[PDB]
Amino acid sequence: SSVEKKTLEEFKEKFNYSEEEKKKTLEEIKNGDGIALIDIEKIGVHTVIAEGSTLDVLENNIGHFENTAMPGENGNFSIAGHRNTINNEVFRNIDKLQVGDEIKITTLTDIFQYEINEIFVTSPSDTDVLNQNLDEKTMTIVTCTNRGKDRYIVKAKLIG
């Protein structure tokens, strides 16, 4: 969209940074900065993930929950695809994803492939979806469902 494209283009430009420059931007990250690309072939999602899950971030971008793992790390890299009761239109077709579909996450240094292994509906107060189990490498997408009343959760495990 507007800010989305910008965040997206600014991040892609950093692929041409050197390694210390990349590492330096790792530290220094601020809410609203691009941190990864996300591609989900099954539903035509090809965009960027911003840091943070505040209302301000989520108005323009898919956002990374602050205290969750980063892509490829032990724990559960968690992303928010709604702002209050409104899904980012980028996830309008998330209900088409199935167990076994792939989610590709590209940081400045690596391509991580996650495979969906759990889909479920829960409440807005179910904070456990953001839990960090450091014995595994997983990711989570949180959007809304049921006229904004419930949360639609997609979880995926790192495969490559």
Numbering used by the authors: 28 to 187
Question: What did the authors write?
Answer:
These cysteine transpeptidases catalyze a unique sorting signal motif located at the C-terminus of their target substrate and promote the covalent attachment of these proteins onto an amino nucleophile located on another protein or on the bacterial cell wall. Less is known about the members of the class D family of sortases (SrtD), but they have a suggested role in spore formation in an oxygen-limiting environment.
Each monomer displayed the typical eight β-strands that form a β-barrel structure.
